[PDB]
Structure formats: C-alpha cells, structure tokens
Scaffold this active site. Structure first.
Site, PDB file in Angstrom:
ATOM      1  N   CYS A  90      -0.211  -0.845  -5.428  1.00 56.40           N
ATOM      2  CA  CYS A  90      -1.144  -1.322  -6.458  1.00 56.40           C
ATOM      3  C   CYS A  90      -1.715  -2.690  -6.082  1.00 56.40           C
ATOM      4  O   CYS A  90      -0.981  -3.672  -6.005  1.00 56.40           O
ATOM      5  CB  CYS A  90      -0.478  -1.382  -7.835  1.00 56.40           C
ATOM      6  SG  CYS A  90      -1.623  -1.894  -9.139  1.00 56.40           S
ATOM      7  N   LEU A  91      -3.016  -2.751  -5.838  1.00 54.79           N
ATOM      8  CA  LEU A  91      -3.635  -4.016  -5.455  1.00 54.79           C
ATOM      9  C   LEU A  91      -4.533  -4.596  -6.551  1.00 54.79           C
ATOM     10  O   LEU A  91      -5.428  -5.395  -6.256  1.00 54.79           O
ATOM     11  CB  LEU A  91      -4.390  -3.879  -4.110  1.00 54.79           C
ATOM     12  CG  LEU A  91      -3.608  -3.430  -2.859  1.00 54.79           C
ATOM     13  CD1 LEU A  91      -4.541  -2.787  -1.841  1.00 54.79           C
ATOM     14  CD2 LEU A  91      -2.802  -4.562  -2.226  1.00 54.79           C
TER      15      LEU A  91
END
Length: 154
Positions: A90-91
């Site tokens: 998850c960025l």
C-alpha cells in the site's frame, strides 16, 4: 546525459544511489527503459528478514518527480503489509505525501523500515496479518523460512 528535465532527474537519482550505501538500498535500470528500474532492499538485521536480499519493480511515471513511482516486490515475502502472492504494497502514504523533494531511495528506505516494523492494522495480506496477530511466534518463523527460501543471495 543531455535530454529532458525528467531524464536529468533520473540520472541524478541513479548516480546518488550509486554513491550511497548500496549494501542497504540499491537500484539500476532494468533493461532499456529509464522509467523502469529494479530495486534492491536489504532485509534488516534482528528481524525475520535478516540475510534476505529483496528485489522490487519500480515503474517511474513520465512526469516524475511530479508524481510518485509505483513499487511492488518481485521477491516473494511473508509480511502483513505485502501481498504474499503478488508483492503489492500500500503506497497511499507516499501517493499523497509525494513531492519533487522525495526520491526513490527514500521510498525504498521507508519500505525497508516497514520490514523492520510491520503495521498489522493497515493490512495488505489478510492471511499474513491474521497470523501476525493470532500466532506471532509462527509469523516470525514463516517469514524467516520464506526469507531463507525466496530471498537468498545475489
């Protein structure tokens, strides 16, 4: 050398990475596209990732540094914040934090920080996160097997 503002920027990032501690964090061009790199992250000492060498795929957008890179692991890894099957992470954080001031090495350092300090409440892999919370001593053992199996030397 000479070329667009984006090309000059990428060139600088690469030389600097090359000049920094490449035992910890490295990156080079994958093949023939300056917008596609392969990254290396050293698995941190005193973690279940210790002695691991992790390869990532870095796709850099054509407007960089005005948009963030996309990063996913290539090396398979057992971690609550990384898909055990696709290497996705998850960025969201760097997405909305992104600015020309940030760099790919720093994106990578913060992923290595995640290795050191997993964040189970914001999970990426439901099965790893369940294990991390429900039977953590097993998590450590599973993550260690996978490191010594999938993340072996260069």
């Amino acid at each position: 050398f000479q070329g667009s503002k984006e090309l000059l920027r990428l060139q600088k990032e690469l030389k600097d990475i090359e000049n920094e501690n490449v035992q910890e964090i490295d990156a080079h061009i994958k093949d023939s596209n300056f917008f596609e790199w392969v990254g290396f992250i050293k698995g941190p000492e005193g973690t279940p990732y210790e002695g691991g060498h992790f390869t990532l795929a870095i796709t850099i957008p054509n407007d960089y540094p005005y948009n963030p890179p996309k990063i996913k692991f290539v090396t398979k890894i057992w971690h609550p914040n990384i898909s055990s099957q696709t290497g996705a992470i998850c960025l969201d954080v760097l997405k909305n934090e992104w600015s020309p001031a940030l760099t790919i090495r720093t994106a990578l350092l913060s992923i290595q920080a995640l290795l050191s300090d997993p964040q189970p409440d914001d999970p990426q892999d439901a099965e790893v996160a369940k294990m991390y919370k429900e039977n953590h001593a097993l998590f450590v053992k599973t993550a260690s097997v996978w490191t010594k199996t999938f993340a072996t030397g260069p």
